[PDB]
Amino acid sequence: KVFGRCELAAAMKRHGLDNYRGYSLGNWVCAAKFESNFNTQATNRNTDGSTDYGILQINSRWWCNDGRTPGSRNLCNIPCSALLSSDITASVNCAKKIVSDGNGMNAWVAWRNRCKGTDVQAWIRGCRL
Template identity: 60%
Template sequence: MKALALFALLACLVPGSLSMYYGRCQLAQTLQQLGLDGYMGYSLANWVCMAAHESSYNTQATHYNSWDGSTDFGIFQINSRYWCQNGDEYSSNICQIPCSDLLSNNLSADVECAKIVAQDSNGMSAW
């Protein structure tokens, strides 16, 4: 019984490490607040749709790409080969961030990096 109580207490102390699944409307509101509506000519609906297909709105989604050893991170599945630094793996790290920053429930890093990806890749063609 004491172990269960201790586990429950620890679970309450680390809520930031839990994955968050945004709802469609909640994500749209957040992305609008962070300046993605109309960014590079893409509507808020475009960004929300892309997040749905890439991560199912999961802030801690990852996908390992066996063909090149890179990993996609976060709600937009931003790739470690080019856009963020994932430990010892070689990366261009164009967004100048650790990939772990893309796994936060705070989407600021995801949005700022997605803006860079969109600028450098002629829009959403990178996805």
């Protein structure tokens, strides 16, 4: 599913990502935009053979199992394809564990390079929330 901007914001808010670990909702929307373009079916292989899945491009090296990432972990105890559902519950819950790992949203390189230090609340502007 390709989410609408405010549609995704509302879904993330509902799931408690708004100000999770102090990251206002706009951070998560901004991140999702540059990770997946709001597409739950997004997948991208990394240089190391691991793959990123879903609206928040969660990595198979550490967080999910895709049957093909050698010497990887599965810290969110899920098959990676579960993250490609039109529903985002698995993504959001796994993201809560990631952003608590110590690095915050710097875990998402695209957030650090494209969202961090910007006016991220602009990503929820005009949204009814």
